[PDB]
Each structure stands twice: as C-alpha cells, then as structure tokens.
Amino acid sequence: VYNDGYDDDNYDYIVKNGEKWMDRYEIDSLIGKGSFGQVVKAYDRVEQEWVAIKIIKNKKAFLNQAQIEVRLLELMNKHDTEMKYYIVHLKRHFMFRNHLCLVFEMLSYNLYDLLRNTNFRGVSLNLTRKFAQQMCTALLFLATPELSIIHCDLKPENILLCNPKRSAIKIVDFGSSCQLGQRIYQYIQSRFYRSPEVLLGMPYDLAIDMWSLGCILVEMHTGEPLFSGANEVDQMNKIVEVLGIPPAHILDQAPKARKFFEKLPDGTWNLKKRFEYKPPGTRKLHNILGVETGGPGGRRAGESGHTVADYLKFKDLILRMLDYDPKTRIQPYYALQHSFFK
Ligand SMILES: O=c1c2c(O)cc(O)cc2oc2c(O)ccc(O)c12
C-alpha cells in the first residue's frame, strides 16, 4: 500500500470520481495522462467554475520538474500584456496528500483531436492562418527578454482550443520548458517536431519552438505529419527529403553530424549508406501543400483564402520556419509581418 493507500504503484494518485478536496474541489473525472501524472476535470465550488487539475506523481523527480513549471508560469503570470492570453493560465498550485497539483483554466480539446474529427483531411488554410497567428503571438510572448522561455514540446496535443466552437487556442504543458538560462536533455521535443539543431546535438535556443510550429501548421492543413520519423535517423532523413542537405557551415560544428552525414574527401557533406529515401530536396513542400492542384487532397479548388497566391504565401512562411540555420529562422515578431497574415 502506497501513500496511506492514496497512490498506486506508479506514484499516481488514485482518482475517485466525486471526491471532494479541501472542501473546495469536487473531482469529476480523468481527462489526461502522461509521464508527469494525471489531469482531472474538477469543479471549484468556491469560484463556481470547472477547472483542470494536474496531479504530479508523488516522487521527487517529477515534483522537482513540476516546480520548474510553476516558477515559469508564475513568471509569465507577472506580465501585463495580452499576448500572455495564448498561454494556459495557472489559477493556483498547492500540495495535496503529497502530490503537487496545478489548477488551470479548463479548456477543450487539443489540435490533434481536432484533426481526427476531420478524419485527417485537415482544417482549412483559413483556420490554419488563425492558428498560426495566435501561435506566433504566443511565441513572441515567450521571447520577451525577462522570460526567454523555450516550451520545448510543441505539438498538436499541447495546443488546446478554448471552446469547441471558436478558434481561440492556448498553449499548455510547460513541464519540459526552460529559460535560456536553464537546460537539458538534448533529447527534447517529440520526434516529429524536433528541430535539426536538437537532433545534431547543437546548442538550442527559443528558435526550436519555431521549427515545431512550422511542422504543426503544415500538419494542421494536410492532416498528416510533415516529417514522421520513427527514430532520429529516419527523422533527419525525412527532413532532408524536403529541405536538402543542411548547410556545410552548420554541419561543420554539429557534434552528431556524422550520425547522419558523411564528409566527402573534398569537404562537402552528403548522406550516408535498400529502398532509398527521396533525393535531397525532391519531396517539395509545393507538392505536399498542393499549391497548384487545389490544396491538400485537391479538396480546396476554388475555396476562398486558398488561391494559388495564398498557398505561395503559406509555403514561404513555412520554409522560413523550416530554416536549418537557427540564427536566421524567422522570429516571432517577423512571422506576424508576413503577407500570410495581412
Ligand atoms: O495543462 C494542461 C491542461 C489544461 O491546462 C487545461 C485542459 O483543459 C487540459 C489540459 O490537459 C493537459 C494534458 O493532457 C497534459 C498536460 C497538461 O499540462 C495539460
């Protein structure tokens, strides 16, 4: 028996629908599970509203990580400006029967759920544009110097709708997040959304989030992951099928560059060693998006906001996001100036 019988064998609190907490919270049900513990829907009898409570595991490591998350949300929740309103709001935090608990505003489903309710056909380029603009604003919030927060784990599942009918979104789950100051694994981000500098074991900064955003937007419009690596080597190879071989001057300083590429005698780089990939740069984003053939699936011929001209703007913005060079990858302020948004 664990924690006087309240935990199970994974350090997870045993959620019992209906329980009341501190004479304040009525636990409704489980809505989420992860390596950190659980998320319940709960009714805050005092404020008279539903909340999402995140119940960290009763175990020292996860508690220390979650304490990082809390300081980072308390830092964000110190800032005036209304950019902060695309980050999920921390309502409070407390210890309960040995678990650190984070009370959040209650939201609706995440964008991977939204994709499944379309049967992975994707949402329209207009909906994607509105998601893009919210997300860049949210990254611009994180970049403000006092914060300089890497989320470190952007993907559809961590972008939630506010309300199932509107298109407002907030970013959740700052449990793997860090400030420019702090760090570390280099094994961060989910594989499909992992920046190349992370794969090559280079130093990363806030720019890695902007890579993940690039891949998320494309996936939201086509329905399928742009780069679905089944492991690090496959990941980098799927990237290279689209963006070609990464600049020499970056590979020249990439600790794990020889995990994927051979330096030819002459100093230029190529891929290594029977179904081959597609030649570098040959699966062109132009055909993935369907720029000239009715958007993904042909399904958008003649729709409004999906003229070839809108698709060229989109492709431009994504490529600027999928820059290999993290010092020239488009930054939040300038993604918002792009003609995709005007
Ligand atoms: O913060 C989270 C969260 C939230 O703030 C509101 C909500 O309606 C759901 C949520 O679901 C999560 C999850 O499944 C994993 C990790 C998280 O941090 C969250």
Numbering used by the authors: 135 to 407, 412 to 480
Give the published text:
Dual‐specificity tyrosine‐phosphorylation‐regulated kinase 1A (DYRK1A) was demonstrated as a promising therapeutic target for diabetes for its influence on pancreatic β‐cell mass and proliferation. In this study, we identified desmethylbellidifolin (DMB) as a novel and potent DYRK1A inhibitor. In conclusion, DMB from Swertia bimaculata was found to be a novel and potent DYRK1A inhibitor.
The equilibrium dissociation constant (K d) of DMB (compound 1, 5.11 ± 0.33 μM) with DYRK1A was much smaller than that of harmine (81.7 ± 12.8 μM), suggesting a strong binding. Enzymatic activities assay further confirmed that DMB strongly inhibited DYRK1A, with lower IC 50 values than harmine. DMB was bound with DYRK1A at the same binding pocket as harmine, adopted an extended conformation and occupied the whole flat‐shaped pocket. Hydrogen bonds were formed between 3‐hydroxyl and Leu241, also 8‐hydroxyl and Lys188. Besides, there were hydrophobic interactions between DMB with Phe170, Leu294, Val306, and Phe238. Interestingly, the conformation of DMB in crystal structure was almost completely overlapping with that predicted by docking. In crystal structure, DMB rotated approximately 10 degree toward the direction of Phe170 with 1‐hydroxyl oxygen shifted 0.958 Å, impairing docking predicted hydrogen bonding with Glu239. However, the shorter bond lengths of other two hydrogen bonds, and the closer distance to the hydrophobic environment of Phe170, favored the real conformation of DMB in the crystal structure. The crystal structure of DYRK1A‐DMB complex revealed that hydrogen bonding and hydrophobic interactions enabled the shape‐driven binding mode of DMB onto DYRK1A. DMB (75 μM) increased the thermal stability of DYRK1A in intact cells.
